[PDB]
Design a protein around this motif. Structure first.
Motif, PDB file in Angstrom:
ATOM      1  N   UNK A   1       4.957   7.873  17.416  1.00 32.85           N
ATOM      2  CA  UNK A   1       6.385   7.591  17.418  1.00 32.85           C
ATOM      3  C   UNK A   1       7.079   8.438  18.476  1.00 32.85           C
ATOM      4  N   UNK A   2       8.017   7.822  19.191  1.00 33.57           N
ATOM      5  CA  UNK A   2       8.767   8.533  20.217  1.00 33.57           C
ATOM      6  C   UNK A   2       9.727   9.530  19.581  1.00 33.57           C
TER       7      UNK A   2
ATOM      8  N   UNK B   1       3.721  -3.325  21.394  1.00 34.84           N
ATOM      9  CA  UNK B   1       3.361  -2.573  20.204  1.00 34.84           C
ATOM     10  C   UNK B   1       4.529  -2.523  19.222  1.00 34.84           C
ATOM     11  N   UNK B   2       4.196  -2.290  17.955  1.00 32.89           N
ATOM     12  CA  UNK B   2       5.210  -2.151  16.912  1.00 32.89           C
ATOM     13  C   UNK B   2       5.860  -0.780  17.077  1.00 32.89           C
ATOM     14  N   UNK B   3       7.127  -0.765  17.478  1.00 34.15           N
ATOM     15  CA  UNK B   3       7.855   0.466  17.778  1.00 34.15           C
ATOM     16  C   UNK B   3       8.923   0.672  16.708  1.00 34.15           C
ATOM     17  N   UNK B   4       8.596   1.468  15.697  1.00 34.61           N
ATOM     18  CA  UNK B   4       9.553   1.838  14.665  1.00 34.61           C
ATOM     19  C   UNK B   4      10.265   3.128  15.052  1.00 34.61           C
ATOM     20  N   UNK B   5      11.487   3.281  14.553  1.00 35.95           N
ATOM     21  CA  UNK B   5      12.317   4.440  14.849  1.00 35.95           C
ATOM     22  C   UNK B   5      12.333   5.377  13.649  1.00 35.95           C
TER      23      UNK B   5
ATOM     24  N   UNK C   1      13.246  17.409  11.206  1.00 39.20           N
ATOM     25  CA  UNK C   1      11.862  16.961  11.184  1.00 39.20           C
ATOM     26  C   UNK C   1      11.787  15.466  11.454  1.00 39.20           C
ATOM     27  N   UNK C   2      10.774  15.066  12.218  1.00 37.23           N
ATOM     28  CA  UNK C   2      10.511  13.670  12.526  1.00 37.23           C
ATOM     29  C   UNK C   2       9.053  13.356  12.220  1.00 37.23           C
ATOM     30  N   UNK C   3       8.784  12.081  11.952  1.00 34.66           N
ATOM     31  CA  UNK C   3       7.431  11.614  11.667  1.00 34.66           C
ATOM     32  C   UNK C   3       6.751  11.293  12.993  1.00 34.66           C
ATOM     33  N   UNK C   4       5.757  12.100  13.370  1.00 31.44           N
ATOM     34  CA  UNK C   4       5.114  11.914  14.665  1.00 31.44           C
ATOM     35  C   UNK C   4       4.031  10.845  14.604  1.00 31.44           C
ATOM     36  N   UNK C   5       3.065  11.002  13.702  1.00 35.40           N
ATOM     37  CA  UNK C   5       1.903  10.126  13.633  1.00 35.40           C
ATOM     38  C   UNK C   5       1.747   9.631  12.204  1.00 35.40           C
ATOM     39  N   UNK C   6       1.643   8.313  12.047  1.00 34.36           N
ATOM     40  CA  UNK C   6       1.440   7.696  10.745  1.00 34.36           C
ATOM     41  C   UNK C   6       0.790   6.338  10.960  1.00 34.36           C
TER      42      UNK C   6
ATOM     43  N   UNK D   1       5.430  -5.394   9.733  1.00 33.53           N
ATOM     44  CA  UNK D   1       6.791  -5.353   9.209  1.00 33.53           C
ATOM     45  C   UNK D   1       7.080  -6.540   8.300  1.00 33.53           C
ATOM     46  N   UNK D   2       6.515  -7.704   8.604  1.00 36.06           N
ATOM     47  CA  UNK D   2       6.755  -8.927   7.851  1.00 36.06           C
ATOM     48  C   UNK D   2       5.530  -9.252   7.008  1.00 36.06           C
TER      49      UNK D   2
END
Lengths: 102, 512, 31, 51, 24
Positions: free
Chosen positions: A90-91, B209-213, B233-238, B243-244
């Motif tokens: 994630x960016x 690619x699937x780009x979630x924020x 804090x942010x979610x880096x890798x998951x 999505x559907x």
DNA sequence: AAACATTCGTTCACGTGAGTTCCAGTACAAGTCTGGTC
DNA sequence: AGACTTGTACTGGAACTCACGTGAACGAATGTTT
């Protein structure tokens, strides 16, 4: 080249079975010894069950370690670590770097 | 958030007259536009796309004037992409038998993107040009064109059938004109912004690619009860999932509202009595008996904690936190609070101290009030651009499995010989996936798996597209490029051919 | 749960010096 | 001790060795709740259908 | 074998959790 | 111009279906045992 | 002949694991009201 912060799932343990294919133990031991000597990990494509997309994983050799009482604490084998895909990252927002005085 | 893209195309007769092997620009342009539309539609970024063509027999533009602004048609206006655009691209678009000035196409596209952008907040405006630059034209209005492009902040992009940027004089003049235009709009950096058709085909063969924020998580790193640093804090890798989801529809009418799923409970008696959902409770198993435990009682007895806690339980050497013990399904990147200099300074000081002492912080993490507390490890991560903490969960006492495995070194019957070890060493040497840069600076990765898009989404999108356009045909096979990207370079296999044969010869593997 | 009492006792005055060095006398956290 | 799966590592199309996969770290979850009839405190069977 | 638990044979006896104990 | 309510993408938790490994139970073959008679 | 013991394989079920789907809560942005 394996990043410690590139964690995706809990790691697994790979150990020879010596029940379906005979002679696999010798090759496994040789691979473990050579990988430990050369400090390399075996990159592989992993498919746990039928009808499951493959995942790129790495096998890191493990060296047997015994405590003072000669009790195993680290079994010998391979550590299977999952590697993230391109979309798995994630960016992040851009943040200016502020330094600290010594 | 949204961008407007006015795709300009040349539909003149010049491209149709070309060597068949060269795959004349008409089909290449159709293929690239089709792939672009596929990526846009299957990746819903809310981007509006319009189509304009110059060199066609017909004329339909907002501006007519005299002989100018002719042979140009605006096929599509700014709107959300849809399969109808793909259907029109496949067959509705056919070559013409006229010639037109691509400058006229540019002015028409500027007019369209200026007139139809009112009322919508578009932060980007890209105009793409697809032409052979083989049509006679005159240059008499470039000054105003450049002025308008600069004033409106409209990006310009070009594609030609050749890589340079064996051609005729007209092609050379067209190339000069386009290069001057790019130099004026941007400058030196704009010279490389001209992309050949084949190069575009190379990069547009893979779905986006699937780009979630990730939403920022504000909290306070606390060392004791007196020190507190504001952090985000942010979610880096998951792990990323679709999505559907698939919706179950009645086979005949093909409607969701025609199906209803429900669950019922019946007793274990012979009569099979009916028990309502208000006449049941929750319970657990305690050995050979069953103890009732209602939901309200469980909530009353539940473990209660204060949510949103990021507390440093302690500091420990990095060597005592092994990678194999990492648990969870996430990695957190912790930065200082936005627009906060004191917090940034404190976080930088902590990170630098930890890096210097080679230490990590064992901490307690809780997302919210109704989230189970976790014990994790935060370690520094310093880069030339930014520095931040990296948090990964750690195991509890209940999460460790104590399994004993037989040793391999001490086993008498599983001891490899010298020849086997030599052969395995040769195999490992031949199958190296990292190459030293002439033994000068560092290593280089031959097969980086982090940059490979997930094939699952690619396959899903391909099959969905094939069904949408071809409702009657079965699904197609997996594309070859997916397999190529999922396999290592052929050089590794070529080098490892012989070592693998030696391994087969030396090791007597047999299946039972 | 962190042992707040023990951490406070061990850190006699280090936290105050760190706050004086970094945080100006206007900064308010958790607000 | 139990093997999650027994797989076949394939160096090539003709060199294959059987291996077993284990999990040395697994999340600990509460025992699954069970639905109980209030009156008799006996297990109740659950079924699902679509119409 | 040394360290074997007296409740569940075949499993290593787990030392009681001590949490955090600061060193001297 | 400022404060409060609503909505939407995100996050966590919990529940249900399908695949894999290990173990209890069952039908039947064969070994073994035994009784009576001439 | 009949009946019991040993074995033999095979079937099905229990338990563990993962993937997929549903429910609820929430912080930030936006719109409306005073």
């Amino acid at each position: 080249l394996l990043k410690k912060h590139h964690y995706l799932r809990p790691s697994l343990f790979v150990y020879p079975e010596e029940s379906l294919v005979i002679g696999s133990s010798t090759l496994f031991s040789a691979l473990l010894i050579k990988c430990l000597e050369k400090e390399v990990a075996a990159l592989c494509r992993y498919t746990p069950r039928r009808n499951i997309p493959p995942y790129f994983v790495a096998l890191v050799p493990q060296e047997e370690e015994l405590d003072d009482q000669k009790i195993q604490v680290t079994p010998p084998g391979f550590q299977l670590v999952f590697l993230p895909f391109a979309d798995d990252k994630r960016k992040m927002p851009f943040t200016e770097k502020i330094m600290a005085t010594p | 958030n949204k961008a407007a893209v006015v795709l300009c195309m040349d539909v003149g007769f010049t491209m149709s007259n070309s060597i068949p092997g060269i795959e004349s620009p008409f089909e290449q342009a159709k293929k690239v536009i089709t792939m672009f539309v596929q990526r846009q539609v299957f990746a819903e970024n809310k981007d509006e796309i319009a189509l304009v063509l110059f060199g066609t027999d017909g004329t339909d533009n907002p501006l007519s004037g005299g002989d100018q602004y002719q042979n140009i048609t605006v096929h599509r206006h700014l709107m959300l992409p849809d399969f109808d655009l793909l259907e029109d691209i496949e067959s509705k678009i056919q070559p013409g038998s006229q010639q037109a000035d691509f400058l006229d196409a540019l002015i028409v596209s500027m007019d369209v993107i200026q007139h139809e952008t009112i009322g919508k907040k578009f932060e980007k405006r890209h105009i793409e040009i697809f032409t052979d630059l083989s049509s006679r034209f005159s240059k008499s209005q470039l000054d105003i064109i450049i002025h308008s492009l600069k004033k409106c902040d409209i990006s310009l992009q070009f594609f030609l059938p050749f890589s340079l940027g064996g051609i005729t004089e007209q092609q050379k003049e067209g190339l000069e004109i386009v290069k001057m235009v790019m130099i004026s709009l941007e400058g030196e950096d704009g010279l490389d912004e001209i992309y050949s058709f084949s190069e575009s085909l190379r990069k547009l063969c893979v779905f986006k690619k699937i780009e979630r924020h990730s939403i920022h998580w504000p909290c306070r790193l606390t060392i004791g009860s007196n020190l507190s640093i504001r952090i985000a804090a942010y979610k880096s890798i998951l792990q990323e999932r679709v999505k559907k989801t698939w919706t179950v529809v009645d086979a005949k009418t093909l409607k969701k509202e025609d199906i209803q799923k429900e669950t019922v409970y019946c007793l274990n008696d012979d009569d099979e009595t009916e028990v309502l959902k208000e006449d049941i409770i929750q319970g657990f198993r305690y050995g050979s008996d069953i103890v009732p435990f209602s939901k309200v009682d469980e909530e009353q007895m539940k473990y209660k904690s204060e949510g949103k806690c990021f507390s440093v339980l302690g500091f420990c050497k990095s060597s005592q936190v092994q990678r194999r013990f990492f648990m969870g399904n996430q990695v957190l990147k912790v930065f200082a609070a936005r627009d906060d200099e004191a917090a940034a300074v404190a976080l930088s000081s902590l990170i630098h101290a930890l890096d210097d002492l080679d230490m990590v912080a064992i901490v307690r993490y809780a997302y919210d009030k109704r989230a189970n507390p976790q014990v994790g490890v935060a370690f520094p991560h310093i880069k030339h651009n930014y520095e931040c903490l990296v948090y990964v969960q750690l195991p509890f006492m209940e999460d460790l499995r104590q399994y004993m495995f037989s040793s391999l070194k001490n086993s008498k019957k599983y001891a490899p010989t010298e020849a086997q070890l030599n052969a395995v060493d040769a195999l490992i040497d031949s199958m190296s996936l990292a190459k030293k840069d002439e033994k000068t600076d560092t290593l280089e990765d031959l097969f980086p798996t982090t940059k490979i898009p997930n094939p699952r989404f690619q396959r899903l999108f391909q099959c969905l597209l094939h069904r949408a356009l071809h409702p009657r045909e079965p699904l197609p096979p997996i594309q070859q490029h997916i397999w190529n990207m999922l396999n290592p370079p052929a050089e590794v296999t070529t080098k490892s051919q012989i070592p693998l044969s030696k391994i087969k010869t030396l090791f007597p593997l047999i299946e039972a | 749960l962190p042992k707040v009492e023990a951490m406070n006792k061990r850190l006699g005055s280090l936290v105050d010096e760190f706050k004086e060095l970094v945080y100006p006398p206007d900064y308010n956290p958790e607000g | 001790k139990r093997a999650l799966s027994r797989l076949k590592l394939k160096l090539n199309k003709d060199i294959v060795i059987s291996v077993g996969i284990y999990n040395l770290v697994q999340k600990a979850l509460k025992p699954p709740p069970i639905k109980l009839y209030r009156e008799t405190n006996e297990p109740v069977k659950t079924k699902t259908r679509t119409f | 074998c040394p360290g074997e638990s007296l409740i569940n044979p075949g499993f290593k006896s787990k030392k009681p959790a001590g949490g955090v104990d600061f060193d001297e």
